[PDB]
Design a protein around this nucleic acid. Sequence first.
RNA 1: CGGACACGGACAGGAUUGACAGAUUGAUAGCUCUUUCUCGAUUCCGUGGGUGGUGGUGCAUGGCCGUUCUUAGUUGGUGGAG
Length: 118
Amino acid sequence: NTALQEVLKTALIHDGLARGIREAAKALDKRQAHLCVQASNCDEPMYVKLVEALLAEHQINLIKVDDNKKLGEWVGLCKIDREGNPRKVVGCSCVVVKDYGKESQAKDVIEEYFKCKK
RNA sequence: CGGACACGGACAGGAUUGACAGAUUGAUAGCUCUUUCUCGAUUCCGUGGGUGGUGGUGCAUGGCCGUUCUUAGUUGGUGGAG
Ligand SMILES: [Zn+2]
């Protein structure tokens, strides 16, 4: 439970992402992105087959989560506030990590890759 | 758009920029249109809003200048006249 809860959220503050309706699946076209994350609630079953057709054949792995509404408070557009509303953004299916830039808590995402998923 | 900012919706399962071809036009303005890529949450729309103005009004004014006015005039205080 260490991989999905805490070691990746620190790699989501100010990195390079794929954010919105004209770029949810734009950053998959980049040969510059490391370990990404993917949501298991797509409306059509081939759009996730569309995006794993990039990564899983290649050197890139996805992490499953539930959906792109629990992912909304992670992507960067803050919707919840002291004087705010609960749901003013609906997040992406798949945001990628192109560069960590530092090594605070990144030893477990790379341990997530080649411990059992090899 | 060079209409800041504030309000909600449209913004991640397809908001907003740009652009070659061509019948497009005054025009190598992608203006529009057919076709179709790119840009990355910056925005666009709705509503209140500043804003800019060689737009009005010099009879609402400030500054300035012009003039009788380049001729020798103007004024209190303090007493006196009323
Ligand atoms: Zn008029």
